Design a protein around this ligand. Structure first.
Ligand SMILES: N[C@@H](CCC(=O)O)C(=O)O
Ligand SMILES: N[C@@H](CCC(=O)O)C(=O)O
Ligand SMILES: N[C@@H](CCC(=O)O)C(=O)O
Ligand SMILES: N[C@@H](CCC(=O)O)C(=O)O
Lengths: 444, 444, 444, 444
C-alpha cells in the first residue's frame, strides 16, 4: 500500500512548482518538506502520494464540540497517513496524534519592519549649531569687523608710522582698512590668527572679546559634534516581549487556528497572558488567516506579527526591510505527524536521526532558505567617517575656489581699467600685464 | 449567601472589561481589586457577587443628620458583606466599619503638571568650571602679566635694538610695556597668539609655563562643555504641601467625600488647617466629584490635585506631562472593609498576609501599575545649540564693544588733553583729530 | 489591673536610659516604642509596666516541638499582655497572636558599606597619557629641537641676511640657535606657534612632521580627558537582590529567630530561594545573633546584612559609610502584639489611627531617628571642575614662575660678569645696570 | 518498585548538595536534572531512587565484543527504569534504548581560551577618518596650494614692494613661490599658522575657505578620536570547526565514550573525518575521560575542547577567560532515556511538553545556567594612552626626520653644484660650506 501524506501550503516548506505542463501526481509540489519526504522514502522504502489538507488549517481544537480541524483532524480520522509539514510539536497536539522527533527547531518571535536609517547627508557638520546661530556668528564677524574699523580710525594710537628707519617727519599709517578688519575677524574665527594685531587699547578689547567669543563658538561646536558623529542608532521602540505587551500603539496578533495563539491562550505567565488579554478583545482584527497575510500586514501597516523563527529565517532573507524583533519566546519543533499508535512513528524517528548525523537536514535547509544576500546590519561599533558624512566641506572648498578666481579676474580688470587711464589703451594693457604674470622670474 | 461585595469603579483598581460581545456578571469587571478578590476566593473559598455601589461615593460621615454613604453605608446596613476596593483605613471609618489589615501602602500626595518650558540659562557656558576656578585664572592672568613685566624690565637680553640696517649705538628698548604684558597673558589664554614673542630665556620660561597652563585650562573646559549644554526644564513653583498653602495662583483640591477631604477637615497642623480654610470657601470649585475629574482639571486648567499615592503611580506612569509634587503627606493603607465585626475579617487578614509572602500582591501591583515607560527626560538624542543654549557670549560681545567705544573716546579725549597744553582747551585737538577720522585717505 | 508589656532591646526602638541614679520601675527605658506606649497609655487610660522578654529572641517557630520562642511565646502563654516592640507582622505570627494595625511600615533590604570615592588628586590632568609617554614627548621636543639645530646650520638656505635695506656685501645670519630651536619645538607643542618659521625645505619637513606630531598628541589628550573628568561613579558590585544571590564572594545572612530569614525559608521564588539555598549551608557562619552584630560585621568584614528598612534609616544616618544597597524586597509592619482573642486589639487599632492622623507617629519618628547630618550622595550629574580636580596646573604655574626668576638673576649675573671684564668693577656694575632697569623710561 | 533512575554526576545538571550535616538519599543531589525529575514526579506521580551509575560513562557501542556501558547498559539490562541526565539523542543509541522527546537544545561546539593580549594597532590614529578621506585632504592640500600659487602669480595686488623706508621703483615681488604655497596649505592644515599671510582679496578667499575647511577636518577628527583609542584583543586563530582541522599547533579533543567522540567517529564530512583522523592517532592524549578534565586541560595547557553547547553556556558564564569558538556543529537534544519500549516514555513525553508550555523548563534553565555576569569587555572605565595606543606618531616622527636629513644633504650637494661651475668639482664648495657648519659664530 502507498501512503497518503497530508500537507499544507506554507513557504518555503511546501509550495507549488513553477512549470507550464499539466502537472500530474506528486509532480506539482516542491520545497523543503517534500524534499524531506523524498529522502524519507528512499530510506524507509515506501511510496508517498501527496494529498493536501482540505479545510486549509494546520490544526486546532474548536472547543465547542471539542473537536479538531486541519491536518490534526486528517490524522485522527485516519484519512491521511503522514503529516509531513510544518506541524509544530505542542502539548495539546501530542495527546491525540503521534509525532516523530523534530527535524527542525522553532521559536516564537516577532516579525516587524526595520526602521529606516536616515543617512546624515553631506552637510552634516552644520548640525551642532542652530541655523539662526550660524547667522548670528556671521552677523558678528560682519559686525565686530565693522566696529573695529570705526574704532581704529577714531583711536589716535593705531596711527603708527611703519618705516623702521628714522621717519624724520611724517609717514604715519593706519593699517586697518575694511579688508584688513574682516580678515582679523575671520582670521580669529577660524582659530588661525592673522598677521595683523591691534596696538591701541581701544582696539585690544575688540580683539580681546572677539577672541573670547570665538573661543566659545569653536569649543561649543567641537563638544557638540562628538554627539552628532556618534550617530545613535535606530532603536524602534520594541525590543522584547515585555515591551510589546505594553503599547496599544502597534497592532500585534497571530495566525488563527495555529500553535502561536494557542501558546498565549493557555499560558499563565504575566506578560504572555497580557498579550492574550489584548488579542482576545480584537480577535477578528489582529489574528490573520495565514502567515502570508501575517507578512503582508507588517509590510503595509503598523503591525507586529507573532510567528515562528524558521519562517522568519526565510522572510528576512527575502525582504530586507523586515527583521526579527526580540528573542525566542519558547522552543518547539516540526514533527512528521503520524496517527495515534502507528508503526511509522519509530521508523521516521530513526530516519530523521540518520539524515541529521550525515548533514542531510542541513543541506536541505541551506538550499531552501537560500540567504540571497541582504544587508546584515550597520554592525554598531565605532563609525569611521566616510565621504557620505563629511562630504560637503569639500563642496564648499570646491565652490570657494570657484568663487575665488572670479574675484581674481575682478582684481585684474579693476586694475586694468585703472592703470589704462593715463598709461595705455584698455584691452592691450590687460595683455601687457599678462606678459608680467606669465614671466617665470622676479622682476619690478 | 453570595457574599455581596460592594465596589466602586476606579481605575486601575476595578474597571469594566472591554470586548466585542457584552459580558454579564462578575466577568464584567477587571483590574487590581478583581484580581485580588479572586485570590481571596481561591484561598478562603466562597462565591462573590460584585454589586457596584449605588450612591457612588466611598464613605463620609455627614454633618448634623450624620449618616454614612457610599461603600461604608453598604457595610453598616449589611447590604454588602465585603468592600474589596480602595477603601482606605482612616480613624473615623474604622470606628464604625471594621477594616481588615492593609494590602497596599498609600499616602496623600499632590498631582500637578510637569513644567514644559526650560530654565533658559542665558549664559550657561561658565558652568564647566567652578567660580573658584574662573576667578583664579584672572588672578593668574593678572599675576603672570605682572611677573612677566618685572622680568622683562630686569632681564638684560630683552633690551633689543630694532634698528634693522646696522645697529650703531643708543637704541635698545623693550617691547614689554605693562600694557603689552597683559596682551601676551590674555593673547595666549585665548589660544590666538600675539605679535609679542619673548626672547631672553627668563622671559621664555614664563611664556613656556603660561602656555602649558592655558593648554590645560582650555582643554579641560572643552571636556565638560558637552555635558553642560543641556537645558533644564523649569522647577515647578510648588515642591511640597506647604507651597500650595502660601499661594492662591494655583487652585488645589481633592475628591469630595473621600479620605483626603476628611483628612484636611480634621487636621490640626498649621499648614493643613490653612489648606482646608482654602478648600471650604470655594468648595463648589475646588472639590471635584471623582478621581477622573481630578486629572482632567489638572490637565485642562491650572490646578494641583490632592490625591492618594498609589493612584498617582498609575497616572504619572501613563501620562507624561503629569507628575507627583513632593512627598507623602501621611501614610495609610487600603483595607478590605467588613461590617461591625464579621466572621470574615480575620480570614482575609491571614489571607492578605499569605499573598505578600508569596509575592502575588507585588505581582498584581506590577501587572496594573506598570505601563508604557513614559520615555524619560534623559532621552536627548540631538541638541542643535541655539539662542537659549549659548546665548550669553552674544551678550558679552555686546558688553565688551560698548565698553570699547567708551575707552576709545577716553583716549581721544586724552590726546586732546596732551595737545591742549600746546594750543587751546578742547576744540583745537578735537577738530584736527576729528579731521583725522574724516580724512580716511590722507596720512598726515 | 496594670498591664505587663513585653519588649526587647533594639535601637532606637527600646533602649536603656543614660542616667546615674538607681533607676526604678519603667524609668530606665527610653526610645520610640515606649514613647509610643507613653501616648497609648494617655489615650486608652491604662497603666503599663515594662518587663522585658526573657529568652532574648523576637519570636520564631522551633519546629522540632513546633513551639515558639521570644515575645511570641510570651504572648501565647499569656505571661505579658502587650508586645510593644518592633515585632513585625508576618503570616506565621498572625495565626497564633493578634496584632493591631501597623504603626510603622517596613521593608527588607541590604545594609552594606559605601565604597570610598577616591578623589582625583590635583595632578589629575596628567592621567590621559601614560607616564612613559610624557617622557617620550619630552624626549621628542628635546630631540626634534636638537635635530632642527643640526639641519639649520647644515642647510645652506636658512642662511639669510635679515637687513631689509640693500646689504651690499654680507650680513648673512642663521637665526636658529639652540635657544631658538627649543622654542620652535615647545611653541608648536603648546599649539601657540612661535615667531620663528623655517625657510629652507631642509627645515620645513622637521617643522612639518613636528606640527603633525603635536597635532595628534594634543588631540589624543583632549579626546581622552573627556573620559577622565567625567569620573565614572562608584558602582560596588551589588545593586539588587538578583545581583546579591549570585556571588559567594560576599557573605550575606540575617538574624537568627527573626522574620528576615523566615521570609527566605518559606519563599518559593527563584532568587530568594537561591539566597536561602546559600544561607542554609553556612547557617551558623552568616546568621548573626542580633541586629547589632548584623551592623558590626558589615563594618569590619565583607558582609552584606539583610535587615529591615526602618532600622537602616537609623544606621545610615549614624554611620556615614553604610548604605541601603538595593530596593525593598517586601513590605511588612510593626504591630503592637496582643494575645489570641484580646480586648486590647481593637482599642489599640483605634489609638494608632488616632495618633497617625494628627501626626504623632511622625513626630516621634523624626525625634528618634534624628538624621544628624550625613553626606547624602555625590548627586551623580554634571561635575563642574573645582580646585580639587584641576588644582595642580596652578602649582606648576606657581613653581614655573619661581623657577623663572632665578634664571632672571642668572641672566643678570652672567651679563654683569661679562661686561665688567673691561668696563667697570664686578659688584658695582651690577648696581649700575640696576639704575638702567629702575628707570621708568625708554633710553639707550 | 521505586523506578530506579540512573544518573551520572556532571555539573550543572546533577551535583552533590553541600551543607554542614551529611545528607542521605535523594536529597544528596541537586542541579537541573534533579529539579526536572522532581517535576516529572509531581506531574506523573511516582517514587524515584537516584542510583548514580557504576561504570561512569554515559554510553558507547564498543567494538567487536560490542556491549553498551554507562547509563545505556543500565537501561538495556533494566537495572534502571529512567535515565534523567544529559543523555543526548543520537542515532545509534535510539536504536537500542528508546528516548523520550527533548527538553533542552544543544549541539557540539568548541571550548577554548579567550586571547588575553591586544591587537596592538601601532598606528591606530588614522582610524577616525576613512582612507578615502585621508587621501582627499592631500589632493585638497596639493590642490589648494596649486590654485593659490596660480592666483598669487596672477593677482595684481600680491606683487608688493617690501622696501620699508620709502619705495622708489622697480621692486615688487611675490612671497608666494610654489614652495611657499604648500607651506600655507600644510601650515594652515596643521593648526599652527605660517609666516605667510595673504593680502589681495582673491588670495584671501582661498585662505578663507581653506581655513574653514581645516577647521572642520580637525574638529571632526577630534570627535571620533575618543572612540578609536580602545585596544582590541587578539582574534583567536580558530573561528570554526574547519580551523582546527587545518593546524596541529592546538591539540583538540572531546569526551571519550560520549556523543561527541561518536559523532566524529561516524562522520563523512571531509572536515570532520580529518578531525577524527587526528583524534584517533593520539587518542591517549586528546581524548579526556570527562567534562571536568576537558576544562582543566583547556586552562592549564594549549587545547580546544569539542563539547556540547549547553555545558559551554554554564562554563563560559562562570569562567571569564574561556569562550565558545564558532557556531553549533550539529543540533541534538537531551532526552530522558527509557528501556526498549516502556510504559513511561509517552508519559514523560507529554510531561516535558507541559513544562515548556508553562515555562518551567526555561525557569530551571535560568536558575542554573545564569551566574555571575562575567564582567564584560565593554567595561573600560579608564584608558591612559600608552605606547600601544598612539605609537605610530613616534614612528612617523622618526620617519620624517630621517627623510629631512636626506633632503638636507641633497640641498647641500645642490649648492655645491651651482658653486661648482664657479670654482671646482666638489671639494671647493664642500669644504668652504663644511666650514660654514664648523664656524657657528662667524657669519660670512
Ligand atoms: N505552523 C504552526 C502554526 C503557525 C505558527 O505558529 O506560526 C503549526 O502548525 O503549529
Ligand atoms: N482613596 C480615597 C478617596 C480619594 C481621595 O480622597 O483622594 C479614600 O479612600 O477615601
Ligand atoms: N525584628 C524582626 C526580625 C528582625 C528583622 O527582620 O530585621 C521581627 O521581630 O520580626
Ligand atoms: N553530552 C555528551 C557527552 C559529552 C561529550 O561527548 O562531549 C553525550 O551525551 O554523550
Amino acid at each position: 500500500r502507498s501512503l497518503i501524506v497530508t500537507t499544507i501550503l506554507e513557504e518555503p516548506y511546501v509550495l507549488f512548482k513553477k512549470s507550464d505542463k499539466p502537472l500530474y501526481g506528486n509532480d506539482r509540489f516542491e520545497g523543503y518538506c517534500i524534499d524531506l519526504l523524498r529522502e524519507l522514502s528512499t530510506i524507509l522504502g515506501f511510496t508517498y502520494e501527496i494529498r493536501l489538507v482540505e479545510d486549509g488549517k494546520y490544526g486546532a481544537q474548536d472547543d465547542v464540540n471539542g473537536q479538531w480541524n486541519g491536518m490534526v483532524r486528517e490524522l485522527i480520522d485516519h484519512k491521511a497517513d503522514l503529516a509531513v509539514a510544518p506541524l509544530a510539536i505542542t502539548y495539546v497536539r501530542e495527546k491525540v496524534i503521534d509525532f516523530s522527533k523534530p527535524f527542525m527547531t522553532l521559536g516564537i518571535s516577532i516579525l516587524y519592519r526595520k526602521p529606516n536609517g536616515t543617512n546624515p547627508g553631506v552637510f552634516s557638520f552644520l548640525n551642532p549649531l542652530s541655523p539662526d546661530i550660524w547667522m548670528y556668528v556671521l552677523l558678528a564677524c560682519l559686525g565686530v569687523s565693522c566696529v573695529l574699523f570705526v574704532i581704529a580710525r577714531f583711536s589716535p594710537y593705531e596711527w603708527y608710522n611703519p618705516h623702521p628707519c628714522n621717519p624724520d617727519s611724517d609717514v604715519v599709517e593706519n593699517n586697518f582698512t575694511l579688508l584688513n578688519s574682516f580678515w582679523f575677524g575671520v582670521g580669529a574665527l577660524m582659530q588661525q590668527g592673522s598677521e595683523l594685531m591691534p596696538k591701541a587699547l581701544s582696539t585690544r578689547i575688540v580683539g580681546g572679546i572677539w577672541w573670547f567669543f570665538t573661543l566659545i563658538i569653536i569649543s561649543s561646536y567641537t563638544a557638540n559634534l562628538a554627539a552628532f558623529l556618534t550617530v545613535e542608532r535606530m532603536e524602534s521602540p520594541i525590543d522584547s516581549a515585555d515591551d510589546l505587551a505594553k503599547q496599544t500603539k502597534i497592532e500585534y496578533g497571530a495566525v488563527e487556528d495555529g500553535a502561536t495563539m494557542t501558546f498565549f491562550k493557555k499560558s499563565k505567565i504575566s506578560t504572555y497572558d497580557k498579550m492574550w488579554a489584548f488579542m482576545s478583545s480584537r480577535r477578528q482584527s489582529v489574528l490573520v488567516k495565514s502567515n502570508e497575510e501575517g507578512i503582508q500586514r507588517v509590510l503595509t501597516s503598523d503591525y507586529a506579527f507573532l510567528m515562528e523563527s524558521t519562517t522568519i529565517e526565510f522572510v528576512t532573507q527575502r525582504n530586507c526591510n523586515l527583521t526579527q524583533i526580540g528573542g525566542l519566546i519558547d522552543s518547539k519543533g516540526y514533527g512528521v505527524g503520524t496517527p495515534m499508535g502507528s508503526p511509522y512513528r519509530d521508523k521516521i524517528t530513526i530516519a530523521i536521526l540518520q539524515l541529521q548525523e550525515e548533514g542531510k537536514l542541513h543541506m536541505m535547509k541551506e538550499k531552501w532558505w537560500r540567504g540571497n544576500g541582504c544587508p546584515e546590519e550597520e554592525s554598531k561599533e565605532a563609525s569611521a567617517l566616510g565621504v557620505q558624512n563629511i562630504g560637503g566641506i569639500f563642496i564648499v572648498l570646491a565652490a570657494g575656489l570657484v568663487l575665488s578666481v572670479f574675484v581674481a579676474v575682478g582684481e585684474f580688470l579693476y586694475k586694468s581699467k585703472k592703470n589704462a587711464q593715463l598709461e595705455k589703451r584698455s584691452f592691450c594693457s590687460a595683455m601687457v600685464e599678462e606678459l608680467r604674470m606669465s614671466l617665470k622670474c622676479q622682476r619690478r
